[PDB]
């Protein structure tokens, strides 16, 4: 149920709730076999039915504190060496195939986040 509280906090704009869910995600991953840890951490931040990431979920819901949230998710993925595949993930369903996070930020008219 760590996946549910991250997608909910990233939509509403809960900064202090989000940092604590990420640190508990840091703790669950460090006690592991250590074989496919980048495959395990992208399994948590992605809805399995659509391919939507928590970065996409924030950009679809523009808040008064959106620009602070995006900096938290990018600084988190950088220290786990997955900044490339986190920022270039795509939708997988046939309705929205190919849509990325840069696509969402332009449509929502977010000139600073782009």
């Amino acid at each position: 149920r760590l996946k549910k509280r991250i997608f909910a906090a990233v939509s509403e704009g809960c900064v202090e709730e989000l940092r604590e869910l990420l640190q508990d995600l840091q703790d669950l991953c460090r006690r592991r076999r250590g074989l496919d840890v980048p495959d395990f951490l992208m399994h948590k931040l992605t809805a399995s039915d659509t391919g939507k990431t928590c970065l996409m979920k924030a950009l679809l819901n523009i808040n008064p504190n959106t620009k602070e949230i995006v900096r938290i998710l990018l600084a988190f993925a950088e220290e786990n060496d997955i900044l490339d595949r986190f920022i270039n993930a795509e939708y997988t369903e046939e309705a929205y195939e190919g849509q990325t996070a840069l696509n969402i930020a332009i449509e929502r008219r977010q000139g600073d986040i782009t």
């Binding site: 679809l60 819901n61 523009i62 309705a95 929205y96 929502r108 008219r109 977010q110």
Partner: protein, 63 residues
């Protein structure tokens, strides 16, 4: 206005089981614990550009 009077007069002489077959609108959840029958209309507007905040669905396709 003349054709509208013809339509409503035809509608009153239908049996009640056949009134249920021809049903305008769809049942939609517009708020928390609030279910209303609604009619859908599409629109294209090129002049007022705004960031979209208020919506019922994040995913914009026919679902």
């Amino acid at each position: 206005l003349q054709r509208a009077r013809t339509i409503l007069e035809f509608e009153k002489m239908l049996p009640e089981w056949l009134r249920s077959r021809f049903r305008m609108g769809e049942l939609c959840k517009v708020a928390d614990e609030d279910f209303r029958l609604c009619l859908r209309i599409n629109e294209v507007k090129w002049t007022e550009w705004k960031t979209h905040v208020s919506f019922l669905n994040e995913d914009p396709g026919p679902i």
